[PDB]
Amino acid sequence: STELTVQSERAFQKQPHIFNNPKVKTSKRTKRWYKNAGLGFKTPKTAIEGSYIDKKCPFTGLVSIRGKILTGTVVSTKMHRTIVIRRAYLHYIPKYNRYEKRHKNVPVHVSPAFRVQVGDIVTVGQCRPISKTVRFNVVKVSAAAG
């Protein structure tokens, strides 16, 4: 569950059209923009005080949350900024009248204002597809048993 420095790659990670004016004495140490996610969900305090960028985040970021809202547990965490959900559910069969246990996987974009690991029932909404698998951004988290 690792993090990084301020700037790492060959660009300078900032947000678009946010201009920390060097001439005026910035009493505050940044101009950190964010938004409210809606659907009753709360921006974490870590997001506002934080120092990541992640343009794909619903918080301090440029994508938006709409479409389906879902939950699920976390089975993989070994990517960079993405986890892998397992929406466990039951499938009916008409003929046998009996359920059958089934699952999918739906990898979502873990933002670095959210500390997740294996366990961690999360809640996560749809956010204008990010890469080939990931269409979902995590918005709320919770632990597993303790």
């Binding site: 069969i93 003929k95 046998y96 009996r98 359920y99 059958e100 246990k101």
Partner: protein, 144 residues
């Protein structure tokens, strides 16, 4: 008891077990490998036009004795040589060599009838008429 898993979630176990016990039904595997369109002499057809090669004396089974006056034909579409029965009385003499007859199944899906051994088929027409009409003298055959 009873064997089967009666569980309210056991349906994939139930359905796999059914799917794999279906093949012992003679007809589920017979369609689903594709065995009519593979190695039955016809390709799912009911009749096939054929060419007469030979006239065969197939002698009947045990509680009978008779020589059955069958014919040995070759398919057009596929090249198979196959026995065929020439039905009712005197209609062997209505067929000569290479008479492009029409073959049907025989009444039991593709097994024999009664006391011809091994034959599957029959002729219904010769070169474009019939055999009922020829046998009851109500049609005369064109000459090629």
């Amino acid at each position: 008891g009873k064997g089967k898993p009666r569980g309210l979630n056991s349906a994939r176990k139930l359905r796999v077990h059914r799917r794999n016990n279906r093949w012992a039904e003679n007809n589920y595997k017979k369609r689903l490998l594709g065995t009519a369109f593979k190695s039955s002499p016809f390709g799912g057809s009911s009749h096939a036009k054929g060419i007469v090669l030979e006239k065969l004396g197939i002698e009947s089974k045990q509680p009978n004795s008779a020589i059955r006056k069958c014919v040995r034909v070759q398919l057009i579409k596929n090249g198979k040589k196959v026995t065929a029965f020439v039905p009712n009385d005197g209609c062997l003499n209505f067929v000569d060599e290479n008479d492009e007859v029409l073959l049907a199944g025989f009444g039991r899906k593709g097994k024999a009838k009664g006391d011809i051994p091994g034959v599957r088929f029959k002729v219904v027409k010769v070169s474009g008429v019939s055999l009922l009409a020829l046998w009851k003298e109500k049609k005369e055959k064109p000459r090629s």
